[PDB]
Structures are given as structure tokens and as C-alpha cells.
Design a protein around this ligand. Structure first.
Ligand SMILES: [Zn+2]
Ligand SMILES: [Zn+2]
Lengths: 952, 953
């Protein structure tokens, strides 16, 4: 054996169904590596995880470890061209990205399996000699600063950082993770530090091989992927860094029995109960936290959630162990509050302790643990094949925590039942060590403290002893039961053999006035699973604001009443999704095909005979009101929204929906339901491990239940229509504008309508999109630093398509001239790019479109698309790619001069401008003055609507 | 004195609101003449009525006098061009027509006021030197045969002739009016007749001056008009023809007590009860007929219709005197029948005699006469000014019947109260001389006779003698009472003073979420009337075919419920039109403004607190079902209908409505109403003898009433959708094809769609429309004789427009197309050849047509209502558009034709609808492209862009 490989991992315990081929190993220098050999993959992929992150930033430069992560993309000693990396990845059908936690910096990529070597080499250089270019450091600090601004008004982060800022300040937990202009440029300059150096020290100090794990997946044999990793990663230095432990919990004596009152941005009510605990990671084999999470989290009859829900105090609850770092964790129970629940916080919490007391009173349930084990065992036997890129990144992450031979199984299986540990953790959940946080708009004005980084308005009190004492005496309550034995565990996993009459694509197999049924027995994956998808068209779902509203409430309340029942099902890997659409309703049922009919029958049955509950109805309606209102507080790309509204024939606005909400009275909804159901068409796609005649019987029962309980009759053919896109005039240019009252950043979509989707008109657009893709990111973000979110690519809607640009910025939408200026740069670029450059792109688009589906639901979505889009072109990718391969540099250009260029005979252009709360480089073209859109419906009315697309 | 005039008559009595000046005179040769001077009129008119008609047809050339009427239009000695007259009229903003009843032939026209003299000259010649060209006679005989085919399968015509054919056949009344090709060309050639002689002979025999009345209306002084009429009509020859009289009734004592059982074309159910009466005409000062008419026909509490409808047997009823001819008349009482009703005819007729008995038992009522007299006197005082052509035609007719001084007032005012004439006519409504027809599909198969001219299937029977007896024995039935006093009779007639800041066009005086109120106070007509129009928007009334069904049903049951109470108001000259539209509902209240808010309020209250009778729901639905179904018997030129369906964004078919009509249960309607009414928006035009504030209150009162009782609130602005027209491809051509299963002609509509309506696009279209207007009629009908129904003109929908042709024909539509297409090339050439001055004539002709001032409130209203319902709000459109029209040149129209209309126009957009018959030289046609045959209406529409909606003003 090789002098550069300290050890070899074999065998690597994997799923019984998993045809990929694993060998792990430890290099001389101390890198733990997993290699995955998949001879049939279209995309190769690799990831590296360094066991350093945010929690190790020097205290005088918050965000350094995050910022470093941003920088390693921007050029290395071997490959100085600042975007050589991300250009290579896009010229060969690939993509890359990274992230930074408290203890991890994780970097991943994928690429056309044929250029795994190129990509990997470019990538290894991040860990050998990054340039940290002085002038690139100066630009990209803004990208980070943008990232932070985006999050400043997100409530999740406000809270995330708030927790950090209310524990021990001297603890590295309290650190600002994201960093920004002040932490990373302004303050270090004033403080006399040199940032580029500190990067380099940091990199040098912590990016040591003893702290890295690498996963590399490709088509190559295990032996070849070996010499390839060894060749590339043997050189990483081993600095021998000691791996950081944080053994002292950030919440000390004084940080406990504290109540926090917090003003949100959105109109949200929320309660965050939280207890500090020791680091349960080392007991991964028995997993006590998960066991107690399973119980406290449960949503079945007898659960905490149920009682709280039944008293009208909460809607949703999550609970379980929350990750901390090596040496400290959390156990949480969060709920959202109703109006009434906000008035009864002390009570809700007493109930939380009463549940906990029940568990103590009964002690550790072995059958419950056994159940959890067997569920996991099955989950794992029949795990879906992952997308390589995510797979490598995840795995590279967990190599730090498990022996090479155990990585695949490790975060899946549970092994010994450990009652003493369940009992040591449970004993940690008590009144005298709890932290409570309430979040509500009604604390507006009553706060005294502003959190430093986000500006969060809050107040902090000691929870009075009388209240803590009252919670310790929490007795049992006969409303709390342990869960009954999960009914929906699927016993039977037979894969039925491929039928004689079986097709490669879905066949239409029932075509009645009542229902069209697309069916395909699964020919690729061979798991005991099925996907059952149904649209139920009825004009009545979206005919008008009030009706949308009701179509929505109806499904929510239905889902809500069903949730106690469906939860056990969902745990047993059999789940469903049901929502309203613009056309009437959608229902998907996915999972193990064994208990699949039972649940389906329940859902249909239940919708057709639904008793609404007044109290329930009232809570949900109010939540929904708030939810509609809270949209004023999303991000500036809002831009996307208005674009949707402007371009579609029918589209109800939030303001419209919220006007009509006041007049959904209980009777009117009751009346609404059987009306909605009286006339329908059903288009279904049933894909997976079921047979032609089994499917027929499925569809049948579905229908029959409807005919029976809701007297459904078929809909008229003419009364079945799709909606249309607005047809923009030639050489025209409109601009609509709003403000965002909440984020002090601005946003913008620019939309270049082209024509109706066809083979050719699609590929022109797709390929142009391909070519510009990364130049777009490089010019608009990397060079010009217009903001953290910059985006280009196709827009497809109602059968029409165009090109879109999205940008979020500190700048005003100006943003336009830069997008227009860029666009000319692209004109010059195509005129100069070589034939062999050009054919690289065609090949990228090619591999990308033709990449085979990995799991059954990836493939169901592919036909779903075809079916709802009413195009039915199941062989699309082959036609389209064959045609693609015919396009010359000449064609693309002509397409550009005709449709996109500043002065195209046929340029159609809309631009949405969301202005902020408060409102050298290449040359921009002079633009016409736009016709400003004063009113949205007026806009639509004075313009043609395209045709609906014909069914190939 | 004057040789040419036998006498001027005295003051001609008029309403005192009638600003027109009038002279009646009798000419030397016996022509009774009325002359109207209106120095303000935009069009002038004249009419001539000849007291001869199809009752005087030779018995062996049926229809000859109808056919003569057709032929006076095609040439006289002084003006011999086959179409000189109809062309002179087109070129000077005139129209023209004629009709032939049993005893009259009536010829009328109008023209630009400037050209009354030349119009009239051309017209007098009809009565002096008609040519009856041999080669025109040959062609036009087909126009008559078409006219008749059209009537063959229509039910009213069939019944009309069937009554004529079961009277005494030896009687003139039994004749066949229209004639056809068989009777006017075939039968006479077989029997060696020269029709041109018999036309010439009949005209010479009967168009004699002693039997003629003339009315002429122009700006000219009354003297000027006198000189004119003397000039052109003194030379009409007086043959002193005895005026024919028909003393003996055709239903003699032998054709009485008959039951007739008729198989109808449409699925209808009807009973016609009919008694013969003497001629009541001479008794016009008292009107015994109309009094019993008014009584029997009443729809108020305690009336006949009222009980009959209560026992769920009948739905509507008419009754009164039907006109006969000099010598005979009829009294009729006709009902339609419910399903139950067809099985209780015997009882229904008894109820009729019970009511008649009541009238006999009560005596005649002078207080009822008195009511009738005032309603009439009020009606005449404040009668709306009539359009000149209708007016002259009408008077010309009634000059024969009444003294000169009395023409204007004779048909209106009452004078004498005659108990004895009432008793008299009321003694003739007895079972011993009754006639009874039941029309019903349930006699299909069971009928033993065929009426020669229409083919009508029927059976005839003596009414069982003790069925008569039982009706003779009808005692009074307590559900029947004479109507009480009529509280809706207006008394306040005060024209309000013309307000301080009032305006020439409607002003938007209210702009809320619930309503847009357009208001204009009358500044032209000064009659105590007002028009109140309302659109209720609710997308709910047309969301789906089912809801449309309810929109409709609801509205009918509501109209039905009110009927008993609204009827009173209607006789009081106060009426309402209420109906469902594609955008929710339309409600109009028209007439004497005095009691109007009483009625409007009753309508809104009712329609917002409605209780639906279970019985009347089941009945009306059955009737509505039939109605839908019955469209398959509507005329082939159906074509219009399929085109409306093919080009609107949204349209439910009669077939979808028919299907979805089964799932309209009583529970389900009861739900609909409150839903529909819950969110509305109202656009209204209140117009007339009302003040700003009076108007604002009316608008508010409507709103408020709905607010109270239907908890109504504002519709969201974006839910106020207008619909769109399908946008056709450049250079495309589609054909939809269907067949009419009842009718044995075929039909066609051709649409060359052009662009959106716009000042310029509109006048380009209208100008070309006008220029081709009569050449089209002349070519496609008169020369080519493709059919009776030949129409060309503009077509306006959902803010888009274009040129259309409708024809109804014997020939197939693959042939009609080619002749229209041929006419299109004939016309580009015509435009090319015509003098600049001939071109300006047409501009002027269209210009005048557009600028014609409205004569009555309802007409000005309509023009404003068009602006509003169409959301163009171009109230001054007529000067804007005319001003612009005067700019146009031959160049512009030629370019226009070549770019939009020509057979290979770069931008021709063509739809043709071909409706085939039950059973399926000349200028050069162009060779056509290959049509795309529209297969599925919905698919066709899905695959094409839609036009924008038009910008408001
Ligand atoms: Zn980042
Ligand atoms: Zn005629």
C-alpha cells in the first residue's frame, strides 16, 4: 500500500438497496475521506468540510470565518483568474456553493461527470494557496454586508441572534456570525488591523488537514478516485490544530428562570420555551434527545399539542433537541400563539410541565423506542437516491462525528435503548432551569433594551418565584396520553413485477368526462413507494377574491382537523400535501405504497363530509388575515409578486384577498364547500409501484367517494380553461413601482418577454440564458457589487416565456442601466467567443437538461410539469437537446438582435421597481422613457392576451 | 280660390306641446293629404297609403298586390334606372319601405331635409308611370318567394293563414296575401297570363287617386309644402273606384263552434279563443271594443288572467279586438298553457265566460270609461315626438278613416260613453258563437288535415253540444272582481325649471365604490317624463352556465311576482324592463316621472327580499326549457348566434344552458340570490324631468334598500370585467359550419374583422359601409336574387369592429361567399370610378345620419346609454367623429380597402359562419384560399390572442 494513506475503510455499511459503491480512508496528513463510485451518474460532485467556523472568529473581527468562505472562490495561486472556478463550473454543467456554521465550513460543487478532475483540482487549491486579493477583499465585503442586510429584518435571525446576546457575553456563543461592513472593514481599519492578513493567519492557522473531511463521488472506479484524491489532497498541510471544545454551557445560573418580551417585524405570536442541556452527541447510539423529542413533539391523540390546540391556545408546536456545539445543546418546545393563547402564557407552560411530568410518571417506554428503531431501519432500507451535490456535502459534514465505516448509517439508525439517559435528560427539563421568550406586536412601546446587531426591541424579567413554584407542582392531567401503537407502519414491501403492457412514459388510461388518468408503473427505482397526484379543477376555487379565500380556509381547516390522524401516517413515511390552486385543488400522496389507499380514502371522504368547527374556523381565519398582512414585510424581490400580478390574466392581490376575508362568515363557507365539489374534472398522475388495474381502482374509489358523499357531476369541457399571459407590444417598455415599508434595501425584476414556448423558441432562450448566466453573476455581483442577490435565467408562465433579471440592492433601480450595460458586454462577448467556447455551453445545457432523475418523485415532477402545463410532451428533453445541438453562434446572435438588444424590432420589456424604505466600469446605453404603470388592472385591460399553448 | 284643390280643412287639432305645424287638405282628384311643417327636422319624409290590398287580389293570381308593391321600386317612365329611387335615397341619407295588409298598400321614405323635393318627385312617379320591367319582374318574383319561405316555418304566420283558411273559403278573407313563385310565375305561365299586363292592369284599375292618402313632412313652410304636393300629385288619375266593403263575416254560423287542433313548429302550448264581431271602427269616439279589451285583458287583482295563473294553468293572456277589414272584426282572448293547463282547456274557457258573465252582471262602468279617457288624453298631450317616417306612414294610413281635422286625435281621445255599444258587443261573446284553437305538440300524429300554403298539420271538430251548454250556464265565480281605482295615474305634470349649473351631456355626479351616477336633466323635450337606467354588476350572474340560468330564472320569477301590481302602473304610462346580462343585471324605469319612485322602490325591495313560490318556479323553468330548445326553430341567419359565440371571450351556448338547467333546484336558487346581491356595483344614468338632488336621492334609495335587505356591499374595482373579442391572424380565414334542422333555407354571416374602435378606424369603416350599403342590396338581392334577407354593415362588439354580411338563401354558402367576394371587387372598382363629388355626397349622407337629433327622451337616453354600457363615455362622439369624417378622401378609403378588406389584403381577417338548409350572366368571383374549418368552438378560441379592451374618455 501507498505511503500517503494512513488507513483504509472497508466495508462501509450501506443500504441494502443502494447500488453505489463506497470506500472510505484516512490520508497520511489526517484528512478523513469517503469515496463514492457510481458508474451511472451524470453529475460528479465533491465536498470538503473543515471543522472550524463562526464560533472561532477572532473577537475583534466578527464574521471573519464567514468572509473567508466567501473569498476562497475568488482565485488561487494555481488559478488566479478571479472567477476561473465558477466559470469552469458553469462551462461544464456544474454549480458550487458553501456555508459556515459555528464549527463548520463546508464547501461543495458538482460538474459534468466527464470533468471531475478539472473541477476538483481547481477546488483543492482553495485549501493550499487562496490569493485573498486585496482588491477582491474590498469588493466582496459588500456581498457579505448585503447578506447581513437581507437578514436584518428577517424575524428568524433577529431571534437567532437574540438568544446569542442574552447568555454569557464572555462565551464564544454570543458572537456575531454573519459579519458586515463595520465588523469586517470599517472597524478593523479604525482599529489599525489589516484584514487580508487576518484572513491568511486564520486560513493558515485553522485550515489544517487534521480538521478536514472530504467526499468525492464519481463514475470513476474506487481505485481511480483513490489516486485522484491522493494526488490532489496529499499536499494540504497538517498544522495539527486542537479541535475546539465548549464544555461550559453559555447559559449559566443567572441566565435561567428568565422571561423575554420581544417585538417582531411580521405580525407573529410565538412562545419559545428552551432548556439548556449537556452535549448529547456522544450518545448518538441511544439518542435520548430524539426519543423525548418524538414524545413532546407528537401531534397524535393525547399529545401536548392536542390539548393546547383544543383549548384554542396554539396551532403548531415543535420540540426536541436543538444543536449547539461540541459541549452544549438545547432542548426546546416552541409553539405559535393564538390571541387567546397570548393571554395565557403562564398556563400553556404549566401544561408543558404537566406533559413532562406524565413522562416522568410512566418512565421510559421501550416499545416506543423499538417503534422508532424499526421505522428508521425501514426508512433506511428504502432511502431515496440523493442528488450528489447535497449528498457529498452532508457526508463530508458527518465524517467528523463517526468512524468511516459508520457514516452512511450513522444519522439514520438507533441502536441501544438507554432508559437511564432518557431519564438524565428528562430530569434536565424543569422549571428552575427554563428560559421563556414571548414574541408579539403588543409589546410595542413597552421594551427598554435594543439588541446590538439587528436592533431587536426587547425586555427581560426574572420569572417570579411564585410562578416557578407553581410549575414544579405540576401534576398529571388525564388529557395527556402516551401515543398509541403507530397504525400506519407499512408491513408489505413487495415490488410488483413489470407488466407486459408497460410503458416508459405515462399512458393516459382513463379519459372520461369526470377524469383523465395518467399512469406509469415505475421502471427505474424499484422501491415500495408510489406517487399519487391529482388536480381537481373547478372555476370556483379562484373565481373571485372571496372564493379564493374560502377555497384556502377550507383546505387549511380540513388539513387541521385531519392532522391528528395523518400525523402517525406521516411518521410512518406515508405523507400528503393538499392545497388550493388558481384552477381548483391539488392533492399529492407520497410514500410507501402499502397503507396508501387507506389514507387517500380518508382524505377524499373527509373533504366530502367535512363538519367545520366554529372555534377552529375563527383561529385559522385570523391567522390567515395576519399572514396576508405580513407580506408587507417580505423581501424586496415582492418584485417577483407584482410581476406575477402584472403578467397573468387573473390574479387576486393580497389587498384584495384581505378585503374579502372580512366577509367569509361561517355559513358562507359551509355553503361554499358542497358548491365547490358539485362539479369537477380530475386530472391525475399515478406513478410508482402500482399496476395499471391497481391504478384504475385507485382513481375509481376517488371518484366514487366524491359521487357518493358530495354528488359530484362532471364539469363542462368549455368551462375548463387555463389562464393567459399579457402580450407586450413591440419596442414597448413599462415600469411599475412600489415601496417596501420594512426593508431599507431596494429590489427589481427586469423582464424581457420573448414568445410562446416551442422547441426552438425555448432553446434559443435557454442557451442564451446559459451563456450569460455566470457572466451576469460576475459582472453584477462579483465586480460591481450591486448586492448579495443577483439572478438571471428563463421565466416561464402560462405558456409564454422571457428572460428575467432579479436584483436586491442598496442602490436605486440605475440597477437598470447596469443590467443594460452588462447586456452589450454580452453582445461583444458572443461575437468574440470561439466556436469551441460556444460548444462547451451547448454541452453544458445538454448535460444539465438530460441529467436523469435520481428518485421517483424527481421523475413524477417531470411528468407533473408536462401534465399541469397542459403540454403533455413527456419526451421533451430528447427533442429539445437534439434540436439544441443544431444552434450556431450566428443563430443566438440573431435571436439577440431581434428580441433582447436595446433596439430590437421586437423588444418587449417590463420592469418592477421596489424602492427601499428610505428612497472605472463599462458604459450604459441610452434608454427610452418608459410608460409608467399607474394602475395594474388598467395596464392589463389595455393590452392583448397571448393564446393558450397547444398540446404536443 | 285654387282649381287643383277641393278644400283646405280647418285647424288640425294637436297636442299643445306639439311644436309642429299642420295643414290638412283634399285635392281635386280626391287625394286626402296631411302636411307637416317642422322647421327643425333633420330628415324629411312622405308616405302614401292606397286603400287597396291583398283582399282585392285577383282570385287567380294570389299575392299580386303584395307583388305590385315590390315592383314600384324598380323603375318608372320619368326615372327608369332600375334602382334610381333606392340609390337617390342612399346618397342623401334616406331609407324606404312598404307593406301590404288586406286592404292597404303603404309606401314611405325619409331623406335629408335638403332633398325632400327630389326624393318626393322620384316617389310620386310610383303612382303615375311604373314601368314593371319584364326582366325585373322575372327577378323580383324570387324576392317574394324568399319572403314567403322565411314565413313558412314561423308559427305566427302559420296560424295567421290557418285562421284565414277555415273561415268561408268563398270569402276574400280566405286569400293568401304574400304570394310566392308558384302563384306569381309558375301557375300564371301555365295558364297563359302575362304578369306584366296583370300588374299594369291592376295598378291602372285600383291605384286611383280617390283611394289615396299622402302625408308630407319637411322644413318648408306649410304653403311651400302645399305647392309641392299639388305639383307632384294633381296629375294622379281619378278612376272613381268604389272602395271595397266586406259586410258578411267570414266566420259565418257554420264555421262557429269549431275546435281546431294545431301541430306547431316550436314547442309551444297555446289556446286561441275567438269570437266574430261587427266592425267597430265607426265607433271610435267610444271604443266599446277596447273597453272590454281593457277589462278581460286586465292583469290586476281579481282579473281573469289572475285566477287562471293562480290555478297554475296559464301564464300570459291577451284579449281585445283584433282588426278584421271594413265589415268584420274579431274579439279574441288568447292564453299560453302550462302543462296542467293543456289538460284543463274546458275549465279555462268556462272561467272566461264566468268573467264575461261578471261584466254582464255589473253593467258597463262609466267610472272605467272615464279612467280610460284620461289616460288616453294624457298620453296624447304628452306623446313623444315620432321619427318622421313612422309618423307619415302611420297618418297616411289613418287619413282614410277619420276627418282631416281629427287625424292626430282620433286614435287617442275618447268622447262618448256608450253603455249600449258595450252591452251590444258584450252580447256577442257567448258560447254559441265561439271558436277554439289548441296549438300543441301532443296533436303530432293525430291530425287529419294539411293547410295548403304553409303545410300546417291540424284537425277540426264540432264542440260537443253539452260542452257548449255547460259554458252557457256559467254563474259568477267569486274570485273575479272589476279592477279598483288606478292609483298609478299621474297627476303632477310640472316640468321643473332648468337648473342653474345644468349641462348638455350627462355629468358623473356620484363616484363611490357602490355606484357611478350619470345625470342629465331634460333640456330639449320638456315632457313630464324621465328615464332611469341601471347596470348592476356581479360576475356571479354569468360565472358558469348554471349561474346564468339562475340569474335568468330569478329575474323572471321576480318579474312574474310583480306583474299583478306593476300592470296598473303600465296602463298609467309607467313601465319597467328588468333582465339579466352577461355582467349581472339591467333595470330600466321609463315614463311619467310622477309615480316613478313608488315603482322603482317596489322593484328593489322585491328583488332583495324575494320569496320564490315553489309552483311558479316549476312552471317557469319548464317554459324556459322549451324556450332554449326552441332556438333550433329560429331562422338560419343562427349564423349571427354562432358568430357571437365564436368571438366573445366568454359565452355559454344554448346547449350548455339546457344541460346545466336540470341541476337548478329550488334550494339552489334560494342560495344564488343572496350571494349575487351581496357584492354589487351600480352604474346608472338618470335622465329627464328630474333635478340633481331628486336624482341623487333615487340613486341612494336604491343602494340603501339593498344595503338594508340584502346586506350589499361594493364590488372590488378589479372584478368589474368587460369581456374581449378574439383577435384573428393576419391573412387568416376560418369557417364554422352547422345546419338548421327546421328551416329549409340556409344562412351565412361573413365577418371581415378590422381593428379596435377608434375615431379614425370607426369612420374608415362607416364610410365604406355607407358607400357599399345599397350597391350590396342592389347586387346581392335585386340583380342576383340571392334571397330576401340581404344585409351588410358594421359590426361592433366588445370594443372591436369590422364589416359583416348576412344573407338567407336557397343556394349553399360555399356559393354565397363567392358572390359576396365578387361584390367586394365590383366595389373597389366603383370607388375608383366615382367622381370626387359623388364621394363627398356619401360623406354628407353618413354625416347627416350621424348628426340626426333625437326626437324623444328615450332616444337621447339610448345614445348616452351606449356610451356608458360600452365604457367609452364619448358623449360628444358625433361631432368629434363627423368633423374627422369630412377629412377623408378617396385615397384613404382605397388604401383602407386594400389593407384590411381586399381578397389579398395583408391584414384581412375573415370569419364565415355557414348554416346549411334542412335538406343539405354575372360578374367574376375571385379564387379563394383554403379555409380553416373550425372544429370545436372552445379550441378555436383557446388558440388565438384576445384584443385589448378600449380606453375610456
Ligand atoms: Zn455568505
Ligand atoms: Zn314584401
Amino acid at each position: 500500500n501507498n505511503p500517503a494513506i494512513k488507513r483504509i475503510g472497508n466495508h462501509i455499511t450501506k443500504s441494502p438497496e443502494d447500488k453505489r459503491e463506497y470506500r472510505g480512508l484516512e490520508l497520511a496528513n489526517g484528512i478523513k475521506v469517503l469515496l463514492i463510485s457510481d458508474p451511472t451518474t451524470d453529475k460528479s460532485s465533491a465536498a470538503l468540510d473543515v471543522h472550524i467556523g463562526s464560533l472561532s472568529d477572532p473577537p475583534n473581527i466578527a464574521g471573519l470565518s464567514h468572509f473567508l468562505e466567501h473569498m476562497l472562490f475568488l482565485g488561487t495561486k494555481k488559478y488566479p483568474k478571479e472567477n476561473e472556478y465558477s466559470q469552469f463550473l458553469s462551462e461544464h454543467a456544474g454549480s458550487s456553493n458553501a456555508f459556515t456554521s459555528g464549527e463548520h465550513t463546508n464547501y461543495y460543487f458538482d460538474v459534468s461527470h466527464e470533468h471531475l478532475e478539472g473541477a476538483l483540482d481547481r477546488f483543492a487549491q482553495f485549501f493550499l494557496s487562496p490569493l485573498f486579493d486585496e482588491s477582491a477583499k474590498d469588493r466582496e465585503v459588500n456581498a457579505v454586508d448585503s447578506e447581513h442586510e437581507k437578514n436584518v429584518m428577517n424575524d428568524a435571525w433577529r431571534l437567532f441572534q437574540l438568544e446569542k446576546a442574552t447568555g454569557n457575553p464572555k462565551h464564544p456563543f454570543s458572537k456575531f456570525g454573519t459579519g458586515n461592513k463595520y465588523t469586517l472593514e470599517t472597524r478593523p481599519n479604525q482599529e489599525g488591523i489589516d484584514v487580508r492578513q487576518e484572513l491568511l493567519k486564520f486560513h493558515s492557522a485553522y485550515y489544517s488537514s487534521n480538521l478536514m473531511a472530504v467526499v468525492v463521488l464519481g463514475r470513476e472506479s474506487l481505485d481511480d478516485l483513490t489516486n485522484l484524491v491522493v494526488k490532489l489532497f496529499s499536499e494540504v498541510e497538517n498544522k495539527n490544530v486542537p479541535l475546539p471544545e465548549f464544555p461550559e454551557h453559555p447559559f449559566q445560573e443567572e441566565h435561567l428562570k428568565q422571561l423575554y418580551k420581544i417585538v417582531p417585524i411580521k405580525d407573529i405570536r410565538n412562545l419559545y420555551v428552551t432548556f439548556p442541556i449537556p452535549d448529547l452527541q456522544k450518545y448518538y447510539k441511544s439518542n435520548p434527545g430524539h426519543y423525548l423529542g418524538h414524545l413532546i413533539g407528537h401531534e397524535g391523540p393525547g399529545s401536548l399539542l392536542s390539548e393546547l390546540k383544543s383549548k384554542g391556545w396554539v396551532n403548531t408546536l415543535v420540540g426536541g433537541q436543538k444543536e449547539g456545539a461540541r459541549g452544549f445543546m438545547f432542548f426546546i418546545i416552541n409553539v405559535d400563539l393564538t390571541e387567546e393563547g397570548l393571554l395565557h402564557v403562564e398556563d400553556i407552560i404549566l401544561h408543558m410541565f404537566q406533559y413532562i411530568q406524565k413522562l416522568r410518571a410512566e418512565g421510559p417506554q421501550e416499545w416506543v423506542f423499538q417503534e422508532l428503531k424499526d421505522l428508521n431501519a425501514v426508512a433506511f432500507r428504502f432511502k431515496d437516491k440523493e442528488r450528489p451535490r447535497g449528498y457529498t456535502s452532508k457526508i463530508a459534514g458527518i465524517l467528523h462525528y463517526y468512524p468511516l465505516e459508520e457514516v452512511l448509517t450513522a444519522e439514520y439508525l438507533l441502536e441501544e435503548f438507554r432508559p437511564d439517559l432518557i431519564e438524565m435528560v428528562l430530569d434536565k427539563l424543569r422549571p428552575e432551569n427554563v428560559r421563556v421568550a414571548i414574541v408579539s406586536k403588543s409589546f410595542e412601546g413597552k421594551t427598554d433594551r435594543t439588541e446590538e446587531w439587528y436592533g431587536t426591541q426587547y425586555k427581560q424579567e426574572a420569572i417570579p418565584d411564585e410562578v416557578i413554584k407553581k410549575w414544579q407542582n405540576a401534576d398529571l392531567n388525564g388529557k395527556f396520553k402516551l401515543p398509541t401503537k403507530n397504525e400506519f407502519i407499512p408491513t408489505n414491501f413487495e415490488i410488483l413485477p413489470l407488466e407486459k403492457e408497460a410503458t416508459p412514459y405515462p399512458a393516459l388510461i382513463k379519459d372520461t368526462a369526470m377524469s383523465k388518468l395518467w399512469f406509469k408503473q415505475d421502471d427505474k427505482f424499484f422501491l415500495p413507494k408510489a406517487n399519487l397526484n391529482f388536480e381537481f379543477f373547478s372555476p370556483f376555487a379562484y373565481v373571485d377574491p372571496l372564493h379564493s379565500n374560502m377555497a384556502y380556509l377550507y383546505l387549511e381547516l380540513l388539513k387541521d382537523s385531519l392532522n391528528e390522524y395523518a400525523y402517525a401516517a406521516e411518521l410512518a413515511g406515508l405523507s400528503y400535501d393538499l392545497q388550493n390552486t388558481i384552477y381548483g385543488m391539488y392533492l399529492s400522496v407520497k410514500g410507501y405504497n402499502d397503507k396508501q389507499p387507506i389514507l387517500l380514502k380518508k382524505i377524499i371522504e373527509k373533504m366530502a363530509t367535512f363538519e367545520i368547527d366554529e372555534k377552529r374556523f375563527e383561529i385559522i381565519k385570523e391567522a390567515y388575515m395576519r399572514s396576508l398582512n405580513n407580506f408587507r414585510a417580505e423581501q424586496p424581490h415582492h418584485a417577483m409578486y407584482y410581476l406575477r400580478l402584472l403578467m397573468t390574466e387573473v390574479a387576486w392581490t393580497k389587498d384584495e384577498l384581505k378585503e374579502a376575508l372580512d366577509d367569509v362568515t361561517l355559513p358562507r363557507l359551509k355553503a361554499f364547500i358542497p358548491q365547490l365539489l358539485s362539479r369537477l374534472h380530475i386530472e391525475a398522475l399515478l406513478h410508482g409501484n402500482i399496476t395499471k388495474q391497481a391504478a384504475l381502482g385507485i382513481m375509481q374509489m376517488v371518484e366514487d367517494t366524491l359521487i357518493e358523499h358530495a354528488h359530484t357531476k362532471p364539469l363542462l369541457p368549455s368551462q375548463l380553461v387555463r389562464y393567459r399571459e399579457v402580450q407586450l407590444p413591440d419596442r414597448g417598455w413599462f415600469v411599475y413601482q412600489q415601496r417596501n415599508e420594512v426593508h431599507n434595501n431596494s429590489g427589481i425584476e427586469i423582464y424581457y418577454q420573448t414568445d410562446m414556448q416551442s422547441t426552438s423558441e425555448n432553446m434559443f432562450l435557454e442557451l442564451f440564458a446559459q451563456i450569460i448566466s455566470e457572466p451576469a453573476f460576475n459582472t453584477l455581483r462579483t465586480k460591481e457589487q450591486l448586492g448579495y442577490i443577483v439572478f438571471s435565467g428563463p421565466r416561464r408562465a402560462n405558456g409564454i416565456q422571457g428572460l428575467r433579471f432579479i436584483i436586491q440592492s442598496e442602490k436605486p433601480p440605475y440597477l437598470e442601466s447596469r443590467v443594460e450595460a452588462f447586456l452589450i458586454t454580452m453582445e461583444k462577448s458572443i461575437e468574440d467567443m470561439t466556436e469551441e467556447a460556444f460548444q462547451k455551453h451547448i454541452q453544458a445545457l445538454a448535460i444539465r437538461r438530460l441529467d436523469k432523475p435520481k428518485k421517483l418523485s424527481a421523475e413524477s415532477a417531470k411528468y407533473w410539469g408536462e401534465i399541469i402545463s397542459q403540454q403533455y410532451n413527456f419526451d421533451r428533453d430528447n427533442t429539445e437537446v437534439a434540436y439544441l445541438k443544431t444552434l450556431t453562434k450566428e443563430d443566438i446572435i440573431k435571436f439577440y438582435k431581434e428580441m433582447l438588444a436595446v433596439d430590437a424590432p421586437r423588444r418587449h420589456k417590463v420592469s418592477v421597481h421596489v424602492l427601499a424604505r428610505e428612497m472605472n466600469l463599462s458604459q450604459a446605453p441610452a434608454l427610452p422613457q418608459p410608460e409608467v404603470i399607474q394602475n395594474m388592472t388598467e395596464f392589463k385591460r389595455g393590452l392583448p392576451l397571448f393564446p393558450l399553448v397547444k398540446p404536443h
